[PDB]
């Protein structure tokens, strides 16, 4: 389904389940799409509720508009599919971008009274490198990967889950070709130009103010060996920074656990959400 | 192009040929889509005939809809598809679920007076044991295939079409990347939930009823080392309570040989239905 | 976004950067799509061009319409998507196939007054041997190549890509899985009927007439090593017959050139686009 946007963008997104049942809303990270949740939104739909996945302007499905990408345009992108199909007060989980989304939704739209949200291995409270920030990676290593968006965006979408994503690049550990594919695969049906602005998006947008704004029940599901999104400087720190928030480490779990260790984030998913 | 459902659901379809020339309607397999149609429509559109192929609710390019995954709504869902484009009367040819999918069309909508039809390692009459069905697979093998449509579907529709399917475990032959890759893609851009439901639909459903009731002559082909769909508990049987029915065995073919065998396939069909 | 043509087909097309900047439109080659582009249009965005790239009948996004597979029904095509857009007096770029859709359009649609034109590794002006052109293929490389798309698409659409196409298959060069794969992906999304039909209308249509009627400046870019499209029958010939065409010799260049060797088409392209 589609709904479009204030600005007219064309957004794709998925609604399974009762049409009354409570509502979870998922949000997914860069560069893939709703197609990331598999896992969770099958679990969920076996677990009495109504699931919502959209996928992000430039992303998947949505149409490939060539500006916009930046926090506060994702933010009311989500503010139209919730508006469009009534899902106010939903609970709303974002992934690795998708918490930035989720966590920006909440500070900017706060007239949508969402029950409590999850963030897994989410890029808050900022990655870039500042004054403020002296523990943010350096852009460098951004901007090499613009340049690889740029430049050989096929192949660089091979090793980014080959390698670091999903801790397919430790010792002993057996990699799937056809989990691979598949993030490779989300990433290719999208805009090379949404992937190459997202990447700002999600590294140079500090969610500070708005973690400290969020007085709902926050869960902070984070892996100690994230190769993607650090740990303490994004996870424990969110954690911190959220009044009501609290902090799940997983040891030895990957950037993409919630799709190679399904099983454990569904069952602590589902307990946080039911209180 | 789409056709919008009764009940609200979008479903693609492919539309290939002059529209007059006579018609023959492929119904894909799951967790496909039309796509998987290829060898089948460019040889039937080089042998004069008007090709048309739709995805099934929740498959390929079809609305990703949570519910209705049963055979009544695919075979409701065949109804607006032969509706939209006027072509009753066509042959109807289904692969694997495909072919239940014929069978409750043609049960459910006998308005449409189709000439011919064509199962192709068909799930008819049933799949799962039951004290009707002894010759059944335990349902503890279709929940185990949910499971892992549920849990990790993504490496799932590598294994599939890298083993069983093709044939391709089978010591000494030789795999095709492209073919394993084309099975994987199709069933990932497919809705996990329509799959996972699917699979219930495929093999749960007794066929029996709507096979004695179809008096059109119907070709039953069948590979007799099919390892998604054994060959003894479903082809054999339907061929034998089809009325005007026939049995076409291929020895040591696989579940897809209309993609490793299309030569074969392509020349036996056209001789049925030509 | 798309367009509806005269006869009723869905043509999809990406259009980027700013409305008022100079536009580049892109023609993709055979059997693709408008994604064959990412690294081209990136590095014109980043230029200052507003960008656009469609995808032609029955390839990719676009729809998966059985007939009119030939020269001049692509380039009533793009006139729809020019007249849709308002992109009047753009400059072209056609890659492979795309060349021949440029020449064409430019050929049948002289109201529009495009700007400049580039012709890479363009199949101008004629592919296949006949006795007006005695240096062509025999028509029974083409013939096999249709044997391919009818029997054995999903594996022959890895070996053009992972052998002849990006010169994967030339000793001491290392392949790319992301980038054939990419091709390959391309390939599946569209039509098996509309690239069976597509590979008549790329080998076996005679530009000669459309050349020698264009008066832009077009520039004519060709590896001599380029395996899919015969440099010596090709590109420079085509050059000898535009009135105001130039060659250009990328040696020892596949006929993926675009995307193996970006940096240099990149700047090759925008020097010339620029003079």
Redesign the interface.
Known sequence: ?YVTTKDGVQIFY????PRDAPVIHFHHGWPLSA?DW??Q???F??HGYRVVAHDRRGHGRS??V?DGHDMDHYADDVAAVVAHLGIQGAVHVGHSTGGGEVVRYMARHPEDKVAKAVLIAAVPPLMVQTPGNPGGLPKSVFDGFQAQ???????????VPAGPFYGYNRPGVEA????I??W??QG?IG???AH?DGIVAFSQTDFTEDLKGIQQPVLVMHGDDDQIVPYENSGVLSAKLLPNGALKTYKGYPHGMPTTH??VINADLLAFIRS
Not at 14 to 17: Q, S, V
Not at 149 to 159: G, I, K, L, M
């Open positions: 389904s998925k609604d399974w389940g197609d598999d896992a939104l099958l679990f739909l076996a149409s490939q060539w968006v740029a430049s050989n965006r096929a192949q660089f979408y091979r090793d799937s070709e056809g989990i594919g598949n490779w695969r290719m805009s090379a130009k190459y399904a099983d």
